[PDB]
Design a protein around this ligand. Structure first.
Ligand SMILES: Cc1cn([C@H]2CC[C@@H](COP(=O)(O)OP(=O)(O)OP(=O)(O)O)O2)c(=O)[nH]c1=O
Ligand SMILES: [Mg+2]
Lengths: 65, 218, 426, 1006, 57, 69, 57
DNA sequence: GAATAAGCAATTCGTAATCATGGTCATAGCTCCCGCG
DNA sequence: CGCGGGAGCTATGACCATGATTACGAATTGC
């Protein structure tokens, strides 16, 4: 791996797809909330808590400083 | 006003620029017919044969066509007589006076009218004979009148017997009014309504009507 | 060629050339025969033969401003532009609809009065008409050298329906806003629906039509028919709020492709509601639109020109109303009364049995000719004793199907008219 | 005082006079002058009120006037057709008079002179000399034509005088121009009043030097210096051009019966008068028989406008303004009117006319001797070839080989000719007088005495060729027939189309029947259906087909149905089925089926669904009686046609019976012609409707018809399709044939009346005998009243390309198995004049090839298409590369007219550019050769546009340049399209058509 | 069945939108009809991609 | 409904709602792609029927608006 | 029941991403580091909105 | 000086207006890439 | 942290070129 340009291009192309997928999950969540069915999100609350925790340590460790 | 040189007869032909696309063919036919034409004493003088070549053709929309000049005293302009002794122009003036009401006139002249070109089919004739030089003027008459009917809107012919073949002698279609000759018997030229028919057919073609009172000479 | 009669024919050719956009198909064919005569006689001529002529009077009418504007000083005669179908009556002397160019059948007293009006002045290009609720109103009268108010009084003498002509005097640069538009519309004081007003100078042609409105879109509750004659019904379309949107013809319903529970392009006015002259963009064909309209109104209604017409038990009453005579119960006193009335007797002489029976029940011409052309007849002594239909392809048309349903009543009236014609002149 | 009428001719100017040219039995020419009046027909009250009184009035009898106006009725309250029976008067006015409400104005004053005075224009009369007064020597005046022309004696022969002439003019340009070009040779065929036929050619001595002139004198030719020194007996006379033109003026001023030329009014006589008034100022002065007035020879242009489309000016004929009574006859206009050929130039007309089959007696290196007799060709063909060969110089062997005559011997019953011919394999060849292997302008450049004598021979051949075409077409017999039947002057017989030649016997009828046909409303024209043309059931016929043709179908339809404008009771139309059924029931109960015929037609208007025309068959109509007159004349000339032995009289009588057939169909056609006085739209529409029902009746009785055990069964009943009649309707018809005949009939094709009946037999004699039995049985049982079918011929090897396009071998009714078949082409590429000779020859060769390898039958049709298309590609590439075939194989032809909807039509544009750029003018109605010519550097063109821009008008002086070439691609495309129409096998033909012309070929659908 | 009720809400809301399209599409001008037709082509792209994901996997 | 005029605000509202409907169906499509890439076994015959009815409804709405003249 | 296993797959995917970031992130260079920092802030905004949608009830 | 004319059917060939199909081009969505306060 | 400027992509309606379809007239012939 030389000059690290390909890795940056790959992570930009991946992270925009990740953003579109996250907005897609939010949109289908709004759809199933507007459908009128009763749902519980406690396991997904634990999941969003642990992924938010790990990505906050990633954000703390990714800074250029 | 371009000019060409010919071998004999007037030795020059003066013509307007609208007459240009039929000029070389005119020289081609005139160079063969004029040598035989010059022996007979013609009713107009040879220098007045192509006076009407000098007239333009864009402003003209009505061709008042005769078959030939007068047998005597041809002035080179069709239906023109300053002496006003010609029956044809007398009864043309009578018809125009019966139309427009202008009866106090010294004479009439079809050349001074805007939009009217006076034409003789055969450009000359023998002194004292009608349609004598038809033999010399066939191809020239066909050429020049087809050139006229390309530009003008309405063609008016002063004769039934003379212009019965005018739909074949001209190949491009044009508004042709085969009227009676003024000297035709039974006062057929007194009865007919050809000049207002010219005006109505001009208004059908969305053209400016001929004011026939411009031709009167006072 | 050269005679006086040829000059006369050429002058008529020029006169119908100047009124190509205004003439009926009879006068268009007369113009075409004159073009053929001038082509055979004068070889080339300026005018050609015409196959399809778009009927438009927009050469004599200015573009509609649709905004408030300052009025120049001068004399003004404001005329109410009504809602119904604009008809013009040229020197060919038949009714001409704008945008179609088809002659349309009218009551004979109106036709004779318009014949008298055109006999009064030959300088009139045409008379502009309203066909709304089957009542013929002169929009306007366009003449080269005469003010239209003289024609309005002259036709008021003959009995035509004439609007309230108003001549108002303007001396300053007055702004023509919507309020003065409402003042002038109520100054007309007509119950008749007006879409706009057109004004004319005293000495200067090229009429302007001024129209203040707003393009609106109201949700449609239903389509309701309203009786305007013995058999014919005007089309009307209703919003959910209860406001009534007026419809010009049934061809206005199919052309706008109106159905229930859909937004429509309506021109709101101060009082009336005006449905716009637009082509429907729903891409449904004309026949299916007719089918859906007849289904949502009722299968007893059929498209008859501009209006729906009803069906039912049709006897001597509608025959007497068609003949415009007093009511007779049996055949014999009916023939005796027709012998009493010479003009009605002459009308029955000039009009055939099928035409009398078709106009008696209010059937259209083309649809009924198409329906009769697809069935068979067992006929004994000029009477329809039995009928059966061969082609069921015409029965998809709900108008043709409705007339086929009322064909028994048509047979009864046809046999009655046949008996009347038999004992009148045989 | 016995005379025979030669010509009738009117005076023009001063007093209106009518003259008769006549000869007595001794040969002395007698002229009778008449006061020629303007004839008008008025009623009794209008005659009593004419403001000035008439010059002469004749009681015409109580004559009915019927208003022939076709007003459609939507019911059966048809008001009676307006008949006003009143006493009538014939107003004879010396000047033209405008009379209000005057009737019978469509007829001419000359026909009114004939019929009211009882004079037949082709008649022999004993003239009462008490009614004749002598004006001068040879001319008389007759004021009373009833009493003088009362005794009609039978026919006697007269010594007719003739002047056949042709002139030859020197041209160094493309065409002679009389202002610059002299006249080289004028030849005259003087046939005087004693029958002496003098053949003499005048040679211009101004083209020859004095030593050359002396050499011509030493060769036996005569030198003259003036008009008085001229000897008509000397066959070769040298003179100056002034003396030559004075001889021409002296001959044309003679009161001949007939001055007959070919293209002579347009070129020869016009050039004579033009050069005469140039060189000496003299004019050829025609004198009246009383010599009251004198006119000069001025060729007046007379133009026939078309009657279809924009009615443009479609034909130009040129005539002579003569008042002496000589019928100056142009054969060029006459053969354009009568014949249908690619070119109407004299070489093409003599190619078509004097074509004979000759066998070879002696074969040499360069001299082939041909003989022709009654055994080589038909009888009279070899005698005509000998009589043409008496003055001929070149004989065209077969079609493309031109051979100079070396020695000519005129036998007793044919010809023996030695020709400059290469050695040829076949023993018998077609001999004809076609083109010449000369270049006229080039042998004008090196003009010497041998050229002068050869062109004297060619010019005397053309002048005598006028006589040979005169007697070949039988123009004097045709003139007599036209004068007798059409009631017209002998000069006025041929110059007019159908309507004028109708107007004579029509007026004879209307005076006999006492009927006047008038109109009030304007006549309306609608498109109406015509004849029924069936689709061909299969393309190829290895089986015999029997051809049954109705004898004058549309005249017999008109006579049977009484289809006249005045016998039309009314036209019942219906916009709907209800009033259609009401009107049908009222039609059955109101109009009886025998007295009235009710003709169901397709509607004139789209709103109508039915149109029934009712015709009253109680009074015989004007159109049926006129048609009975014309088929009486046609049956008379068919009777002389069957009684004619020589091919000359056979061709003349066949042409005259065809002419009467055409005028009988023209009686029909004027009822469909809106500008005719006899226009009756319901009658012509009912004529085609009754004709179509006759077609369907004869088709339905013959389709599925079988003959078995001597008993012939028609598939449908023998019912009259219009009404119930007393004749039997049983299809089981007794024959006069052997019992063992078991044959089936299938109507495969019908082209209007002619139905093509395919018998399963292939024997010629059996098919001819069976079809004669079918014709007799149909005429006795199937048909009715005037309807009679005729078995024309047996068509073997019928190759039906499409409707009206078939190729077959004909076995006529008088023929048998041993008789030679005649190859009849009808509407194919061989007949069509817009199809080149290369196309015709290649399609004939490839049709013969296809017939051969279809008669082989051992190999599949896909390989038939492959082999024929491969041979086609090889032949077309060989023609494109080698270019051995000349321009004469690739000249198309079409007629020049002005009848064009567009003023910028490319054909009219091309002819006008030719007339501007070349001294040869193409008149209206002239046939010109045109070819598709492109520059030679242009390669093979796949995607092809602007085809009409490559057209070039080709004449006799045209030579294809080195830079120019024939555009072979359009001829090859048309030939390939015709061949792939013949070949079927559509997919591979599309592949070959795209690989060679890059387009989709048009395939005919059956 | 969260995706099933999501698609049920999708088809119900889209049925309401198509009902409004049926209400207003008779009087639509050309440019807005072209815009809603563009959105309908994007609709067809979305449901063909969903068809590909439920067919191929 | 009421008395509405000048449909371009209604056109923008219908296009915005159709944008929402497109984002919702693309959302469920890419999360279906993600859960199919996860590896769980799914049976989607009723899903295919729902897509077929959705496509029929969409082309029913389509056929009234696309074609001019 | 498909959303929880899809979320588990996303947990595995982000675990892979965080492990490879910890592998490679010894040098990042400043402009792409600022770009992925702004990407992480936009991602934090999106996850905050989804947290609001799961806590709104 | 001025004073007629036959119809329709059917086939082929060429020209020109019309339309199906495909290539291309402005343009609206449309969606990320980057950036600056 | 949040919205504006910008650039690349993807279709998409519209315009135009090319070639096949068809009406339209001429030309001919058969009838
Ligand atoms: C030739 C020709 C014919 N017709 C009409 C008229 C009838 C039908 C059939 O006539 P046909 O020549 O086949 O046979 P037909 O003449 O009827 O039978 P004959 O040869 O007279 O026995 O066509 C026509 O109108 N003009 C024409 O020039
Ligand atoms: Mg026949």
């Amino acid at each position: 791996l030389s000059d690290l340009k390909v890795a940056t291009d790959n992570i930009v192309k991946d992270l925009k797809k990740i953003i579109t997928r996250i907005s897609a999950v939010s949109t289908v969540l709004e759809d199933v909330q507007a459908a009128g069915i009763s749902r519980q999100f406690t396991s997904m609350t634990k999941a969003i808590t642990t992924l938010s925790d790990l990505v906050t340590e990633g954000k703390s460790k990714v800074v250029r400083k | 006003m371009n000019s060409v040189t010919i071998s004999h007869a007037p030795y020059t032909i003066t013509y307007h620029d609208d007459w240009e696309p039929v000029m070389s063919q005119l020289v081609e036919f005139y160079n063969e017919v004029a040598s035989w034409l010059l022996r007979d004493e013609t009713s107009p003088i040879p220098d007045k044969f192509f006076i009407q070549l000098k007239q333009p053709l864009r402003n003209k929309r009505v061709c008042v066509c005769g078959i030939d000049p007068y047998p005597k005293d041809g002035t080179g302009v069709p239906f023109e007589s300053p002496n006003f002794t010609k029956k044809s122009i007398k009864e043309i003036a009578s018809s125009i006076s019966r139309l427009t009401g202008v009866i106090d006139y010294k004479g009439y002249n079809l050349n001074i009218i805007d939009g009217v070109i006076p034409w003789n089919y055969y450009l000359s004739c023998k002194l004292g004979e009608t349609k004598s030089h038809a033999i010399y003027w066939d191809k020239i008459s066909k050429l020049l009148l087809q050139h006229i009917t390309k530009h003008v809107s309405v063609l008016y012919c002063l004769g039934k017997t003379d212009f019965s073949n005018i739909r074949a002698k001209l190949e491009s279609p044009v508004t042709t009014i085969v009227g009676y000759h003024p000297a035709a018997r039974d006062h057929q030229f007194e009865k007919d309504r050809s000049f207002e028919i010219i005006n109505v057919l001009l208004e059908l073609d969305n053209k400016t009507p001929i004011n026939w009172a411009q031709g009167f000479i006072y | 060629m050269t005679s006086s009669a040829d000059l006369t024919n050429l002058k008529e050719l020029l006169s119908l050339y100047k009124s190509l956009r205004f003439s009926d198909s009879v006068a268009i064919e007369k113009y075409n025969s004159l073009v053929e005569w001038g082509t055979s006689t004068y070889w080339k001529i300026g005018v050609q033969k015409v196959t399809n002529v778009e009927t438009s009077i927009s050469d004599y009418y200015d573009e509609v401003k649709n905004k408030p504007f300052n009025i120049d000083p001068g004399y003004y005669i404001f005329l109410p532009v009504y809602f119904g179908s604009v008809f013009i009556y040229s020197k060919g002397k038949n009714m001409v609809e704008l945008g179609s160019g088809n002659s349309f059948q009218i009551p004979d007293e109106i036709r004779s009065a318009c014949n008298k009006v055109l006999d009064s002045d030959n300088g009139i290009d045409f008379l502009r008409f309203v066909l709304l609720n089957n009542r013929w109103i002169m929009e306007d009268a366009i003449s080269k050298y005469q003010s239209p108010v003289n024609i309005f009084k002259l036709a008021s003498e003959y009995g035509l329906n004439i609007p309230n002509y108003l001549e108002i005097e303007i001396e300053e640069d007055t702004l023509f806003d919507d309020e003065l538009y409402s003042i002038m519309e109520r100054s007309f004081d007509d119950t008749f629906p007006k879409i706009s007003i057109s004004y004319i100078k005293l000495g200067e042609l090229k009429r302007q039509v001024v129209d203040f409105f707003k393009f609106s879109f109201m949700y449609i509750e239903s389509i309701k028919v309203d009786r305007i004659g013995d058999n014919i019904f005007i089309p009307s379309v209703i919003t959910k709020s209860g406001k009534k949107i007026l419809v010009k013809d049934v061809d206005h319903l199919i052309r706008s492709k109106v159905r229930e529970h859909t937004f429509v392009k309506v021109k709101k006015k101060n009082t009336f509601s005006i449905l716009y002259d637009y082509d429907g963009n729903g891409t449904e064909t004309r026949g299916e639109v007719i089918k859906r309209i007849i289904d949502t109104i009722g299968r007893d209604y059929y498209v008859n020109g501009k209006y729906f017409s009803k069906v039912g038990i049709a006897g001597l009453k509608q025959l007497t109303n068609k003949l415009d005579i007093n009511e007779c119960a049996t055949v014999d006193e009916l023939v005796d009364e027709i012998n009493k009335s010479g003009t009605v007797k002459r009308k029955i002489k000039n009009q055939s049995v099928f035409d009398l029976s078709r106009e008696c029940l209010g059937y259209p011409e083309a649809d009924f000719i198409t329906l009769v052309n697809n069935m068979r007849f067992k006929i004994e002594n000029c009477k329809v004793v039995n009928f059966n239909i061969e082609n069921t392809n015409c029965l998809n048309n709900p108008s043709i199907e409705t007339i086929y349903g009322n064909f028994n009543q048509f047979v009864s009236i046809f046999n009655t008219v046949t008996d009347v014609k038999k004992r009148l002149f045989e | 005082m016995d005379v025979r009428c030669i010509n009738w001719f009117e005076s023009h100017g001063e007093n209106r006079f009518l003259y008769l040219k006549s000869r007595c039995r001794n040969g002395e020419t007698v002229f009778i002058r008449f006061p020629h009046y303007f004839y008008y027909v008025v009623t009794d009250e209008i005659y009593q009120s004419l403001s000035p009184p008439p010059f002469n009035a004749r009681p015409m009898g109580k004559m009915r006037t019927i208003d022939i106006d076709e007003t459609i009725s939507y019911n059966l309250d048809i008001k009676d057709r307006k008949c006003s029976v009143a006493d009538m008067w014939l107003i004879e006015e010396p000047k033209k008079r405008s009379i209000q409400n005057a009737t019978m104005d469509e007829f001419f004053n000359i026909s009114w002179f004939y019929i009211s005075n009882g004079i037949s224009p082709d008649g022999c009369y004993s003239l009462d000399e008490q009614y004749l007064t002598k004006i001068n020597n040879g001319c008389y005046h007759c004021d009373d034509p009833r009493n003088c022309f009362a005794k009609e004696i039978p026919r006697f022969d007269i010594p007719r005088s003739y002047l056949f002439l042709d002139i030859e003019c020197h041209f160094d340009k493309k065409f002679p121009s009389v202002f610059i070009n002299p006249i080289s040779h004028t030849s005259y065929c003087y046939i005087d009043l004693s029958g002496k036929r003098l053949l003499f050619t005048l040679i211009n001595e101004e083209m020859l030097t004095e030593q050359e002139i002396q050499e011509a004198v030493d060769r036996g030719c005569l030198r003259i210096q003036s008009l008085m020194e001229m000897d008509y007996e000397r066959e070769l006379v040298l003179c100056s051009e002034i003396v030559l033109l004075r001889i021409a003026k002296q001959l044309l001023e003679l009161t001949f019966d007939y001055v007959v030329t070919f293209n002579g009014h347009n070129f020869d006589l016009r050039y004579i008068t033009n050069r005469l008034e140039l060189l000496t100022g003299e004019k050829i002065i025609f004198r009246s028989p009383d010599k009251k007035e004198a006119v000069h020879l001025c060729i007046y242009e007379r133009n026939q406008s078309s009657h279809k489309g924009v009615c443009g000016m479609a034909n130009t004929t040129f005539h002579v303004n003569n008042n002496n009574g000589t019928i100056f006859f142009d054969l060029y206009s006459f053969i354009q009117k009568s014949e249908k050929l690619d070119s109407y130039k004299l070489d093409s007309i003599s190619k078509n006319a004097f074509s004979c089959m000759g066998k070879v007696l002696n074969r040499g290196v360069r001299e082939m001797t041909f003989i022709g007799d009654d055994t080589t060709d038909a009888k009279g063909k070899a005698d005509t070839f000998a009589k043409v060969l008496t003055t001929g110089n070149y004989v065209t062997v077969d079609e493309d080989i031109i051979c100079k005559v070396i020695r000519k011997d005129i036998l007793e019953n044919g010809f023996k000719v030695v020709l400059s011919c290469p050695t040829l394999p076949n023993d018998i060849y077609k001999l004809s007088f076609g083109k010449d292997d000369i270049d006229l302008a080039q042998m004008y450049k090196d003009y010497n005495l041998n050229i002068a004598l050869d062109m004297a021979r060619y010019c005397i051949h053309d002048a005598c060729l006028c006589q040979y075409l005169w007697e070949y077409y039988g123009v004097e017999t045709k003139t007599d027939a036209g004068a007798a039947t059409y009631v017209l002057p002998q000069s006025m017989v041929f110059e007019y189309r159908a309507s004028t030649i109708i107007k004579g016997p029509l007026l004879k009828l209307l005076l006999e029947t006492k009927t006047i046909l008038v109109r009030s409303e304007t006549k309306q024209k609608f498109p109406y259906e015509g004849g029924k043309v069936f689709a061909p059931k299969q393309k190829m016929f290895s089986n015999n087909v029997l051809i049954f043709d109705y004898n004058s179908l549309y005249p017999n339809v008109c006579i049977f149905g009484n289809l006249s404008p005045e016998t039309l009771v009314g036209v019942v139309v219906s916009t709907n089925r209800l009033e259609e059924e009401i009107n049908n029931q009222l039609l059955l109960q109101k109009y009886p089926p025998p007295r009235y015929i009710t003709v169901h037609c397709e509607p004139r208007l789209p709103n109508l669904i039915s149109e029934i025309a009712i015709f009253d068959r109680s009074i015989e109509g004007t159109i049926p009686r006129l048609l009975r007159t014309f088929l009486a004349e046609r049956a008379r000339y068919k009777k002389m046609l069957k009684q004619a032995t020589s091919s000359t009289e056979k061709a003349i009588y066949d042409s005259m019976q065809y002419t009467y057939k055409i005028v009988a169909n023209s009686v029909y056609g004027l009822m469909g012609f809106r500008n005719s006085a006899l226009y009756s739209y319901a009658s012509a529409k009912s004529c085609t409707s009754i004709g179509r029902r006759m077609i369907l009746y004869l088709e339905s009785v013959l389709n599925g018809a079988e003959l078995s055990n001597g008993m012939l069964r028609f598939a449908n009943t023998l019912s009259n399709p219009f009404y119930m009649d007393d004749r039997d309707i049983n299809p089981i018809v007794k024959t006069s044939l052997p019992i063992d005949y078991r044959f089936r009939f299938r109507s495969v094709y019908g082209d209007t009346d002619s139905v093509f009946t395919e018998i399963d037999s292939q024997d010629v004699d059996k098919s001819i005998e069976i079809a004669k039995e079918l014709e007799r049985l149909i005429n006795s049982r199937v048909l009715f009243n005037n309807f009679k079918i005729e078995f024309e011929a047996v068509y073997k090897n019928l190759i039906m390309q499409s409707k009206k396009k078939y190729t077959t071998m004909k076995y006529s009714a008088s023929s048998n198995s041993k008789s030679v078949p005649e190859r009849i082409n009808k509407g194919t590429s061989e007949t069509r004049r817009d199809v080149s000779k290369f196309h015709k020859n290649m399609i004939k060769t490839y049709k013969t090839r296809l017939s051969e390898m279809l008669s082989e039958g051992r190999m599949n049709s896909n390989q038939v298409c492959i082999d024929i298309l491969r041979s086609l590609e090889t032949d077309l590439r060989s023609e494109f590369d080698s270019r051995s075939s000349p321009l004469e194989l690739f000249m198309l032809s079409r007629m020049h007219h002005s009848n064009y909807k567009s003023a910028d039509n490319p054909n009219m544009y091309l002819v006008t550019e030719y007339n501007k750029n070349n001294p040869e003018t193409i008149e209206l109605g002239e046939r010109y050769y045109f070819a598709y010519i492109c520059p030679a550097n242009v390669p093979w063109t796949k995607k092809l546009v602007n085809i009409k821009t490559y057209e070039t008008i080709i004449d006799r002086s045209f030579k294809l340049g080195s830079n120019q070439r024939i555009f072979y691609e359009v001829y090859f495309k048309r030939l390939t399209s015709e061949i792939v129409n013949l070949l079927d096998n559509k997919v591979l033909c599309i592949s070959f058509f795209q690989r060679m012309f890059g387009s989709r070929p048009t395939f005919y659908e059956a």
